Symmetry: D2
Subunit: 313 residues, 4 copies
């Protein structure tokens, strides 16, 4: 309980929100129309404590796609159902670019970590094996519903259709992983890519996503339902990798100055977790060179400076 | 206070110690005679809580050189005296090998981080500039005395002499850094290398070093004297980088499975920090492929599994 | 005329052939059944001078697929029809792995050179644009007939079918090239890959292929028909790149010790050219670590030592 | 004899010279004062056929330092005296940057080739081992006198002094090579660097250097004295490597468009060899991004287009 008075803290959240609001730099992702449509002025921040206490400011009810923010979530599901040992038989745990800038695989022919595309694609192939794609999708949707305590969790068909149609790089990754036998025996690679595109197209709001983050911050228990959603093992692994691989090539500077587990997405979202304290979702479409939401990054740095939430504070 | 009963915990430390004792693999460093002399069976573990409570098992009073274990300590001193902004004007904060396996510098012509040789050499050039080497050395020795609450802090002249005489790679690094103007204006590169070799040759015991670690775990206050030795800023930065760059190329697997800030050295030492709980020093000469003490690594994994000290537990 | 007496030279060719015959190391390619079927003892060498004089020894009438040996040939066709400037607008001319080990593209997002798969795939997309694949294939077949002075030029449907079905890496390359807009406007990437697989599946004999090589050695004029098949520009460019990029990662050692333009293939063939003297085709299924025919490599080194054919002799 | 009439050819050389004279781009090297002093308008071209016929235009009698142009010459001396096998026991033959951009050594801990600094430094350590530096220097000076048929061969003490004083990168290379045991047993690395700096400081004129090149073009026999200076083996190896590694990172484009063995230097010189025809030395201080003389590069491209001297023409 580093927050003696929730109300006062709420008052500081609004100030930080207001401050980040002035930051207008960045560029809204436009590789597909569904992302290009978004207004650069959309900006929201939702908070959900381990207590179940809530607070939102800004555009917190406008749905947007998780995109890469879904990576830690599906990695968590895989570990929850299969265990650490099995999952990392197919994907690495290294946060570095070691000496593999852009390579789809490391020297052991394994994706570097679950937080980059090649790794997410492999993780996607491990979940609920043996059933059709429709059944796999429903399975993950239910899982996300629990993580979000039944709050907003939708799907963007337009994003899915455009993502699949212009995802040449992801298809290149898929064929290379097939080349190196990176998938479990009997995997339909193309079918796995569709499932991958679908997962990136799942929609949330800052409010529902903040609850998902709060669940990770609460050892795997949903703060607003009390249900155990993920195993302690799944949560710990997910946080470790979000800490070191969740903010693209900015992970290093982020880990040093912010020191919190987080995961960004091209839609402008930033899933932030403050272990044993709260979960958060910051969202603002304009992205910086690294691909991280400009307002989100600013807010995160300010939040840690003010409240001393850094893991090593 | 994750340790309700110190005595019971002490009892578990002995069991873990005993367990790691069976691990006999590894190779004692032998690039110089001063390291080759050490018996592979030397094994000690000292603990010093934020309280000031102590406990040792094994060879905890046999002096050994800090070697790379001194890197976070001198980085801490630099930040303490110069501030974060200035220090990182000369050295990076990236834990990755990004795409620089073995390179002495990153694309910006800066050492990757304070935890690799090139970075340590640059950091060494920033401390107490303007005075002779003898004065710089005395300054750091006093600083280490405070960190250790006046316990054992010596110096190995034989190691220093051999380190300097066979350190061709460090001299190559020194001339390259000079090439790229990596040092502050007016630096005597060769003189900086001597100071660097001297720092690596400083001796400690598991007992004194554990107190140094406890000081880092206690926000910069020495647990057995109550004195403020390092600024909060220095401690936080040091821990962040020990977490991501302190265990050579094993940092990734270490961060994932152990989740604690640590720094190893070729003498077989492992400076371990459990934020707000305790500081530790594990020592055993036999090193694994990565250059980390075999017994130390084993002990660290066991300690986290048993006591749930992982940052994200 | 470095060959005063053709008959005596013919006698030396048989000795070299006999010598290489003792070299039995290597492994027959087996990624597909059509290559795995081949006997490791098949060994033939055909020679065709700029004069039109012929000579064969060994298994010179057993058809085998050109595979990568077709790369310089189709590159020659492209330049012949489009000119140097246009072709290299899509592919590089660098023989080095510069700092791109295995990368499909260089820093300018262009395949390194026409002699590696990504480059061959792009070159394939430039030939006879606007017509259907069947028409493109017939066009190249006619071109090869001329180069071979109407001698054996067939097609292996089984190889084509297997190559396409197991070519995951080539499909990964195709999608990446599409990602980076490497193909001319309006290219059907998948359709280009089929054409690429078909070209690799074209069959020849040592005898017909030697004539193709002789055509390159004769400034673009077929030695046995007198017809101008390729422009002087096409021949010069092709030879330059065969010299520096035609023997996989062995190109460097090959260029130094043999000094002749050549191109190997996984079927065990080695298209060798001795400028203004003769063309040759060596064939033996067993390949070395680099992917080059063991007997072929041995024969090439011996040929240069004995007859002093090295470009700088 | 691709030059039926020397006089007419001489007339074309003047036209090409005049044409390149208009090219004024580039920057005179200025890392040391001795290079910075040179006027950007100095431009000369000397030719010396295998016959012994001469021709000069422009500033052909102004002395300038060989710098890197000396690399192939000292490599030739080493092979001449020690043989191919021994020399390449210490240095590679690969022209590529393979996957070693800037690295001082390849995966086998050997310099990539004799044409880059690390390789030149190692080659320098193999010549006339066992005698003092003064004796080694005199030995090479005599060798160069023979190669130049006793024409201008001097020494720049000022360049030597400045080269050694600011050569931090070369000293870094020297200590790294020592680290990896790259030198023959008992080598005084620092003493080798001085010898290396001295060799780079040897002076020539376009006229004397053209004779050195003519000697390489004439199988190792000096065109104006008839004496055998280098073994056939030494000449062939030197030309092979000049062809693939003599023009810095431009070697690839140079090999493709010019197709001649050449070696550039930071003083603006370009040692050009036309096998069995002539030797040439082009000189003009202004260098391009790659470090090659702008006028020299232009002249070389024009020379090949006009006279069809390309190895594969
Ligand atoms: S990009 C292109 C497709 C890929 N090609 N290679 C890849 N990963 C490695 O090749 C591993 C490696 C990294 C460094 C050294 C050896 C092997 S991914
Ligand atoms: S090892 C040898 C001495 C070094 N050479 N280059 C180094 N660092 C970079 O060269 C930075 C770079 C990394 C990747 C791309 C460009 C520049 S260190
Ligand atoms: S493997 C994988 C698919 C590829 N990814 N990157 C590739 N080529 C470059 O990324 C160019 C580059 C080389 C070196 C530095 C920058 C850019 S190919
Ligand atoms: S720059 C710096 C000093 C050097 N460090 N490493 C170098 N060469 C390799 O390290 C060989 C290597 C290249 C690629 C993979 C393994 C080993 S040179
Ligand atoms: N759908 C995008 C997401 C990118 C991102 O969120 O960073 C991809 O697969 O690359
Ligand atoms: N003196 C050694 C220390 C190595 C280590 O502790 O890892 C060096 O400078 O490389
Ligand atoms: N069809 C093979 C040919 C390989 C070779 O000839 O080297 C490929 O496309 O990789
Ligand atoms: N003395 C310079 C010569 C550079 C050059 O000629 O390219 C060096 O050793 O780097």
């Amino acid at each position: 309980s580093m927050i003696p008075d929730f109300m006062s803290f709420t008052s500081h959240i609004d100030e930080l929100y207001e401050s980040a609001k002035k930051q207008s730099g960045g560029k809204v992702a436009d590789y597909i129309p569904q992302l290009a449509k978004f207004s650069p002025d959309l900006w929201g921040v939702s908070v959900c404590t381990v207590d179940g206490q809530r607070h939102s400011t800004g555009d917190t009810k406008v749905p947007f796609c998780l995109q890469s923010c879904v990576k830690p979530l599906k990695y968590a599901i895989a570990v929850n159902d299969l265990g650490t040992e099995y999952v990392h038989r197919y994907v690495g745990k290294e946060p570095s670019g070691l000496r593999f800038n852009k390579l789809f695989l490391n020297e052991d022919d394994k994706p570097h970590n679950p937080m980059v595309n090649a790794g997410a694609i492999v993780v996607t192939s491990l979940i609920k094996q043996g059933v059709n794609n429709a059944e796999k999708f429903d399975y993950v949707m239910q899982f996300l519903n629990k993580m979000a305590g039944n709050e907003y969790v939708g799907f963007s068909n337009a994003t899915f259709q455009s993502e699949r149609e212009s995802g040449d790089r992801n298809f290149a990754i898929g064929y290379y992983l097939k080349e190196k036998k990176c998938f479990p025996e009997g995997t339909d690679m193309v079918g796995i890519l569709d499932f991958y595109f679908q997962l990136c197209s799942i929609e949330v709001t800052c409010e529902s996503a903040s609850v998902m983050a709060a669940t990770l911050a609460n050892g795997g228990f949903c703060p607003i339902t009390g249900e155990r959603v993920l195993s302690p093992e799944a949560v710990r692994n997910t946080l470790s990798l979000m800490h070191s691989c969740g903010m693209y090539d900015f992970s290093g500077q982020f880990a040093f100055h912010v020191g919190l587990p987080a995961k960004s997405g091209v839609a402008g979202g930033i899933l932030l977790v403050v272990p044993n304290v709260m979960g958060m979702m910051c969202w603002s479409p304009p992205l910086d060179k690294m691909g991280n939401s400009v307002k989100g990054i600013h807010f995160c740095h300010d939040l840690v400076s003010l409240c001393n939430f850094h893991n090593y504070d």
